[model samples]
Target: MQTVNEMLRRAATRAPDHCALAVPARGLRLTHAELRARVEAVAARLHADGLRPQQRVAVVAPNSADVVIAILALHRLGAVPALLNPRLKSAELAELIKRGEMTAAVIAVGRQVADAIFQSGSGARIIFLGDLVRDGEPYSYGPPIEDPQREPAQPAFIFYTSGTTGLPKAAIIPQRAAESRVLFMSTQVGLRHGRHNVVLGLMPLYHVVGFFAVLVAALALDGTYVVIEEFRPVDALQLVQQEQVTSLFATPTHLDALAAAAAHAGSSLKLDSLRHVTFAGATMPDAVLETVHQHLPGEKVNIYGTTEAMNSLYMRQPKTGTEMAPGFFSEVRIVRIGGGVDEIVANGEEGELIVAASDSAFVGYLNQPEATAEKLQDGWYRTSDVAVWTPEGTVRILGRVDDMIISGGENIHPSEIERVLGTAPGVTEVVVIGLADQWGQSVTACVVPRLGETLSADALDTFCRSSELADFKRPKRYFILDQLPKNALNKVLRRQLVQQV
Candidate 1:
């Protein structure tokens, strides 16, 4: 297998004139040949600065052409790229740099957050991405005149989890892992060159899904990408119409906003150019799914996976109520937690979903061997998610194992409560969790209502009583808020909400 560097060199020779990257705002564009030259120049500078292979180099920047250059350059030198969230608080950034053992970092010039990161006493050497390579440097290294092959198992990048369990742990990705993932996803999603596929880059490139699933997929297949630094519904709609963007990968939250913006635009904005859309990171409310389907038909895919496995299972065209085929990928089984190892739950019974590790599976968590060992056993990742498989072999995610709440003498899943609560009129978003109570724990629902909509606790309670939810499973308390706390990927922070309560 060819390493990432070797792949780029091949592309440079085969399709040198192909567009490698484009940033509309910055007026930056690069072809395959130009991108390879830039990567070589940057790698030479880093090597001259005493940087070593396998060392961690952090990048703190928003979506830009420079960001892509830095990542490819690091891979060329066999260094690990530790992508950092640009919006992280100073203290959090300091802790992350320390945890990753970063040798150097690349920060965006003139960013307000850069000041805070430098002031936080992070002792790593920093370089501005805008000034990566200049004409005159102490030493200049040319591109590989003779291509040398690197092992597929070599570590390529490190991606941090959402920190939902605690502080984020970096997951190490190997070159073969990335290559296999790109090949698998491209085949599964039917992505091909010469088809003019355009990826909507709403998610940050720092996230594993964005880095491996989207950006890498685009580069590997030679597809066009339209990146949005921050999501603005109107702006995104305009871009889709202007750029003729065909494919998009977004979270449910972004889809909801786009639905609203399209309605507001009425006959002005035409989204007929869009071909397919995929949602991940969080579950989609049934109402939002229905709304999106009504607006844009036959283009929705819900993917379920984690950073450790990239994306393992996917449910495509759910809006059509179609069943997901079982043979899309490798083995996906339902493992009943706390049960015997040989016990597989019956069809339609909810249990923890376990996916067998494939060539695409991530290597392991960086510096967290114990955690990795606990999750990866016998080549299957114990995904904490609870799911049920229908007779048609469609996997329906119920909730996470950690998301279950035991109150009184009954165990309740928060997703059930949240689903019922979302059906209530005027409820835009809702998150259910267990709160400490005198009798052990109580079920609580925190809801965010639609703009200008009023929430009535009495009406919600009355509605819950009439719904299918049992008395014990219903939310004992309700909190109305402007928005549910979310991470960079728009996943609800249930722990943060519990702490606030």
Candidate 2:
């Protein structure tokens, strides 16, 4: 099996002069060979600083070329890099840093920020990119030691799950999974091999979409990765046009904003360079999908996976937007809620979704066997997300099991109502949650109305009255808010909404 360093080397050999990485905002660009040199330079310095194979090195940084170089540098030295969310609280960051038992960390948020957050007692030496590698400088060191022939089972990366439910767990992904991801991205996700893709890197690198779908896919194909520090819709649109970006992998929230920004730009905006587009992490709303379809020229695909398992399921150019098929390397099933993997539910009935564990699955959560055991069953990874088979045979995700609302003995899924309400006139965004009431829980609709439009409970009630939604499923309470709470990836935080409401 080949390592990421080998993949980079191969890419560089194939397209030595090609643009491999760029940070447009900072005016940084690197050719394949140049990028490899930077990575190797940093690797040599890290080796000199006493880094060794299999050591845990945390990568905490915003989306930048330096962070990308740092990750590859770690791979060059055969060290497992733990990609962490930079938006997390100091306490959370410290906890995960300790959990990974990291020996070193690549901190791009300045050494002062790192010093205040990562305690000295944590036993991890913090290193900045400037300390290891410099721009347009030559390093007088030998070839960085590497293991291009590491076993498939060797730990490659550690990514913390998005803690929508509770505390986040560290998922250790193996080298084999990284290989499977590139294969799946090309074959199944339609990111063509040697397509010379110029991908837009808007999502956080800490996320799988940014890591594999955006970064790895670009490098393995000898393509260009245009890095943006954060997602600003107008700025992203400008970058796509300026960089001539040919592909994008982002969350629904990101696409929704881009669509809106494009609309505001009118007929002058041109995204003609983009040939491939994909979304994952959370569901893409019907409204956002339609808007993106109208504005962008790329084919849309919906990828459904988690930190534990990448390339689980995907839906290509879906008409309904929520239906997805299992990926080539995945076996997905709908089992009875809280039942074993073998306790599969009938096609029409709602149940928890599970995927057969495979090479793409995580080895286990670091130092959390009980939590790992709860998720990984006999031979399956319990998604804890609910889904049902459509009459047409596609799996339709109905939000998380924890998100299910039991109101007056009726089980309600918020996603269903959110989709319907999202299309209502004057409604820009919507999230549904259950508010405790005498009837056990009241179905509540939190809505964000369009600019210059007035939204009322009377209007929503009138619209739902004539819609296909069941009478009991109607939202009993309405709250008009400017915006719903969302994470960095743009997923609505229902727990945060509950507290705010």
Candidate 3:
């Protein structure tokens, strides 16, 4: 496998005329040749600015052609580009920038989050993307960085995880690790040159799935990308039609929002160009899958993997109403928790999902050697998720192992309670957590009611009992709210809810 820069160089040599990226709002289109030249130009600027190899440069921008240019440019300069979430609060951004030791930052012009840097008293130099040299400016192809000994094993980027506890930690994403992921996903999903695949860039580029899977894969395959800065249903639908997007990668929440919009329009939006859709980040409900199948025909791959492993497993070809795809990509093993530490669960027995780490696995969390040692052991990443394998060799994910609660000597998984609460009359979203009790830990349901609906705590308890959940699994208490707090990717912040409780 080649470094990401090497891959870009290969693409440029093979097909310089191929479209590399398209930003419709900015009227920007970059062929392979043009992308390389612009990347060199940006590299020259950073090099002249005294950015040393292996140092960190934070980039906070919306999805655009320039964002890709900036990333490739930083790689050329041998600097790690730490992409920050633009939606993060100023205080949060400040802490991350400090921890990342960002020497410089690139921000989109007029970005609301850019103001946060100033407010946070950050001393790092900020370069506005909109102010980058235009076409008429003389393109300077400066010599490579003074240090020429950097290898593929060196860190290329630092992506922060969606921290459920405390502040987010920056995960070291190395060049070799990224290259392996590009190859793995492309091989698994069949991305090839001249495929004419158009991907929806709704997932924030700061995310692992977006940065590695969508953006990096699109560049590696030389495919066209339709960037979505802010997810607006009407605008997204129009862009899909206008750009003729063949595929889209999004979370389950994004699909649900789009489906709701299409519902209000009284007719399904015709997307004749769509061939397939892929989803990650969260679990996909059966109802949501049914809606997607009705609207979009062809493959609807539900991927189950994470940032730590960078999508080691994938359900390639899926059928409607099926939870697991036949012959998924990677190998899976389930080990019984606290059962002598070496006990492998029998087929159909529930246990923790663990994957063998290989080239595609991340190096570790940035600057946290202790945490890395705890997560990675003997070339295997013990994903905290629980699962059970069916007789058909399909793995069914059964929520996180850490989410288990014990009350009155009975072990309970919060997902079991939340599944029942999800069907409640006025519930829009639901999260369950365990709190301390006299016996052990008691289950609690934090329910977000549908708009304009009234929900009573007693009613929720009665509803849970009406369902099939056992007495121990049922919530001992309920808290109703208008909406559930979510992170940048729209995943429910269960840690915040647990803290409040």
Candidate 4:
């Protein structure tokens, strides 16, 4: 039936002894059959405790084998797993619990946080990951449970957006869509089925790329998923080197950090096992890509999409850095900013990016009809990202509509200014934002200098003055810092920067 559980079952049946999950740092590993057996035991316990089909159950934990088993266990019961970031504040967790109407929670958090989960007025069942299985008996290998015959459009997962601008929205991804994303990633995104592929579980499981693209795809393809509970650049390098990891799927932030760590190690690090490096969630600056090109041993690929739909546009080999063509089972167009879906812009013209909704698209935001309506119209998901279509028929993303900087009555896109400063000597990371000032808003640059390197606002100003950036578009002020603030997905928090910088 190609259902989520069915995919796991097939993998176990085909390769029972193949490594399915591993936590190198913790010295834990599970075979495909072992993982399935563990999942069956957990599902049975949850079902005995009153979990049922279609009920939303929150899966809150960091990147761990327990979290993986919890997600699949929820799937075994035909329950919708609302993957959530454990690091979210109490207020944020309360809102998500209310929005998802979570009937139960399968958590691996400590006692304090688990108690807090119930304080949100959700008198739901709390099934701790530690209590899902007893001492050893049922962990034995056994026949797989009957796959649930869920309708294609039935909700399979509820992934919350990063809420960089406001409260996070719950994106309801249906069974068919979720399955299709896993298939696309496993088959088309350079990941081969079976023991040859070893993927890094670097992205948070709360994010779509982390859950469907990295974790589930590895399972469907019968590959191994090396877990990273918390990301440290040096540890990641060491894990890849020791484990002989083959594939990496991370955001630009993660790659940037890894590049720095690899550079610091110099000839001491060996990452020749890495074959494919795929990045999404946010734009990758030219400098980061250049460093990756020089140091990382993989074919670089860019995936451009949103929580509403994934793989809308992809660059298997980006030419102008961020240029992406349409991916498999996806379609996209450039429309005038704030215009309807039909308002198509000419090639080489800049506009908002809208992608055609496919079978692999989300149903809608949970209980957010107004916001959903604004986002999806006429079979297209309005991405709210400004982009331009190249004459050669590729899409080039500029920045977000809300991220545009208005200074002295001129609209300035941050990507333009960022592209200039991203290559500036000694700058490791840069983000441009508008800060309130006498001119309504001032264009400000927040930069992180390279390790052992120092940067000054005067030096950057002089560099910008010599560059092609227009006089007004130049950053009026600069803040040199060690690092920029990021959400769980490693996307820079521009709004947070506005409040702080």
Candidate 5:
């Protein structure tokens, strides 16, 4: 029932002594009143440094108490934050600086980015968070917006893409929309503010899922966010049991690691309080879910989106789950294949997913007009994800267009085989790829077997042939692997798999 600032005000007023943030690394915890105070102190420093409302402020730092504090401070001062990955190499960081023109930048101390920022000659005022938050001065609270919809559109955040396909580009999300997003999600999902809703902060804050679906949502609900500096499975499980964590979000890989650790630990590890479990960044493997069920069995929420598209789909049961209705506020359109075709299709005639959402959606990429034009045509965001309209209206996401295979002049989707093989006996996880050969890029399957189970390629071939999948769709070759190659977000690098095969 409240916006971002309104939520902050309510949290501070109703629960002044409530723990708002926690960091075990520094042995730090801040109450709502204390959290608000620190934000005011840091916001004052930015304003006192001559930064103004609507001006851009680049923030280059790792996940820490200070990073989240700096982000909130920028919102208070109305300066849009361009969240940069401190881990980015120098040249990439240099180009990003030009894309995000700013009056100033707030960076982490003991980092090499300041040198890169100066080398670009795009000099703006630079300050380190460690130096500014040394102390606080009295400052009154400011609403996220003075008058909603009265002034020009204000930037909410400038988060970078994961760069799965190419170089990372910056996307601009509106401030007002972000505030509304949390409120809407609260009603849509069961994200309510309470002690039981303590969110596990493990996803990297720089990415979209972590920034929007995890971090901002946690703050919006005024829930205790137990921040983790980095993800370590054994340590994460310890935190869950230690803090009695109720809600948690992680990449599929993180979730997998936690489940493996818990299963491996057996009765020694207790996760009675770990109920609300979900994952983003990539599809959640049922195998991982099955493993996690051994300790904590909970319905998982699947959040899907791009930084440019924001979060377009929210699945309660995730894979193979049914949708009862479409959202009134957001419109999703499916058209035949991506490049400009807009025909709606059903069943096997799958279409690429397109979306139109004023709130909780990105306006465009910062300074990359050509790239923006390709994705954001006619205010409808083009998602490279291909989906099929089940005769009943459920949307089944079948990999990206780039991941499709063309063998023997037949278009085959690797996801189709992967999904079919996923439930097969002894197959813990499966990734299907097309490798070029005499058959004109034959379909091959990379299988990860159960820990102690083994299956021959011929045996798997017989298993697929027995299923409903057509002969051409069946895998011609199977290469068993211990694990798939994944980036930070846990998305399988298919090219890396290609190199592996």
Candidate 6:
């Protein structure tokens, strides 16, 4: 927040002719000056439209330059942007708006979503992005700020996090922290400054990586931020070659999909410009990483972190097949559960991992002071994921210490599912947990049906698919429970369910 848009303003001033952002699929591109002007223009429109500084607004849209323009514009106006996933079901979207007390929702999707928000009594002023940014009377940016309440903790982003209890926490991402993240990405992940650098920005902006790592990092560097509205393997590969995308951010699944697609065609495209590929998870062999690099000349590195901590750890070209990662910002700890770092056991000893870096940490969950307090303790953010330190100088993820699971790279919160399930007829109690599977993580539902009522996985699946829960969040497996394994206090022992599975 200290520098705020000055990061972009300086770049635009120095390199006004350099490309700032681009979406190859749509043929949309903006130079440094062009992007800065667009943001300020939109900011002027926002201010005139009655959006004040520090006010919260929901920006719902898929991945695109428009999303970036709108969010950065809101930032310019000193408004907090809650970037919501466009794929969100109506019920979930409306609930988030009400919870955030959004002054308005600038939708780039369609009118159907806006109408639904109004019907839900979210009381958010809805504006079709086309109508607001495009249809508004031509306006220019107002005067510069005489004083800016700029700091690392200034609210800039509000993304939802599903906790161990299935409660959703609206995580507050701050400007200072986000800028710090760009510094980390460049230093650790090799996203350097200059027009020669290009990032394939496909991660959804509703999430942290897409918001910062993909869009902000590229723009901050005066590099062209190539956008992908939807990921089609062949299209992504084409963009890499056509746009000469030098740096790429992806998940193992995304790489696997690209390889699978190429294998299906019996043809692999060579990438001449690609230099770096960053993925999440454990130390994978070069052969495993070769799926993407086989077509390109680049080294693959494993990046690990959470939405709360951003990216905290990285593996830099493991010499061995298995390696430990160094924290990007030099702040990671192997702490005990409910505490900070514990005894220094053997290198591979499993313990709750706490990541360092408080200045760039989240500003706390919206309206969730207790949850925020629980996440940040003793100046460390609890990863809650069990991690092992390798004598090989790498950190390997074991599993989550809490009931949460990572299914296909997405965090699956059982409590969110339980809330919807509880509303269903003939359901007395239900517990959702992740099971080990070839897909990496499998979501499973364990249920305690009401007396004299029958429940089946198929029936429940239909209910969930018909609801607001994302597809990946839905349980792939189900088991009926005579009663959930509980302690004396009758608390559901989710760990026991994992043990049973």
Task: For candidate 3, give the lDDT.
Answer: 0.73
Put down candidate 4 lDDT per residue, 1-501, tens digits, no spaces.
Answer: 377787888889998999898887667888999888888877776676667889999877777787788788889879999988888765577667876788987777777766676776776678776666432223323334455678988888888875437578999998788676886675457777767878888988999899888888888888899989889999998988888888889989899999888888987989989888889877787778888777777877888767789778777755445788887788888998888899998777788999898788899999889988888899998888888887877888888888887788777898899899988999999999999887888999999999999999999999999999999999989999898998654678888888887
lDDT of 5 by residue, 1-501 (tens): 233555576767767787778886677888778888877767776666667777888887777877888887887767778888777776566667766778787787445667777778786667787776532222334323232231225566788875446457788877556655565446545677765567788877777666666776776566777888878899988888787777787777787788888778887877777667766566555666566555454566666656765556666755432232234355787887755645676555767888874666777788878888878887688877777666666666777877888899777899778978988899988999999877678899999989988978988988898899998898888899999997543568898899987
lDDT of each: 0.73, 0.82, 0.73, 0.82, 0.72, 0.73
- The local distance difference test score of model 1 is 0.73
What TM-score would every model get versus the actual structure?
0.87, 0.89, 0.89, 0.88, 0.81, 0.76
- After the best TM-score superposition of candidate 5, give how far the Cα of residue 427 lies from its true spot, in angstroms: 11
List residue ranges in candidate 3 displaced over 4 A: 109-123, 133-150, 260-270, 317-329, 338-341, 482-501
On lDDT, the stronger of 4 and 5 is: 4
Clashing pairs in 4: none
Error of 4 at 230 (Å): 2.4
lDDT of 2 at 245: 88
Each model's Cα RMSD: 3.6, 3.0, 3.2, 3.5, 4.8, 10.2
Tell me the deviation in Å of residue 372 in model 4: 0.6
Candidate with the greatest TM-score versus the true structure = 2
Give the per-residue lDDT of model 3 (tens digit) for 248-296. Answer: 7888878776666656654456677876678877777777877766655
In order of TM-score, best first, we have 2, 3, 4, 1, 5, 6
**Candidate 6 runs further than 4 Å off:** 1-4, 110-112, 134-149, 165-167, 262-268, 281-290, 293-296, 318-323, 340-347, 403-501
For candidate 6, the lDDT comes to: 0.73
- Residues 56-126, model 6: lDDT tens digits: 99988877676677888888878888877677666677788888888999888766777788988877898
**Residue pairs of candidate 1 with colliding backbone atoms:** none
lDDT score of residue 354 within candidate 3: 78
